[PDB]
């Protein structure tokens, strides 16, 4: 709440997940990969469509 105000700096605020050693214990995690050499731009828009 206190920081929701700012219209000039996104500011997440969160607890660490219990076994620090493991980074982020929630939900899911994936990489999208440029296999057929399509380039950063296409890749960037595949990210954004997704």
């Amino acid at each position: 709440m206190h920081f929701f105000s700012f219209k000039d700096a996104m500011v997440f605020a969160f607890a660490p997940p219990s076994v620090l050693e493991l980074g982020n214990a929630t939900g899911f995690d994936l990489f999208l990969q440029d296999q057929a050499g399509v380039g950063h731009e296409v890749l960037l828009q595949a990210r954004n469509k997704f």
């Binding site: 440029d34 050499g37 380039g39 950063h40």
Partner: protein, 50 residues
């Protein structure tokens, strides 16, 4: 004659290599070897058989 690996370059997003070498026909028979000129200290193109 021996090819040369000068430095690298990008191709479809990969680091590959750039090779310098005499074209096929100026390195096939030992006369093609004479065809090659070297610049000398006072600026002039000397042939190999010299």
């Amino acid at each position: 004659w021996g090819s040369s690996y000068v430095n690298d370059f990008i191709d479809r997003g990969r680091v590959k290599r750039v090779y310098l070498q005499g074209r096929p026909d100026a390195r096939m028979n030992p006369d093609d070897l004479s065809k090659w000129y070297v610049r000398n200290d006072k600026g002039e193109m000397v042939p190999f058989n010299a």
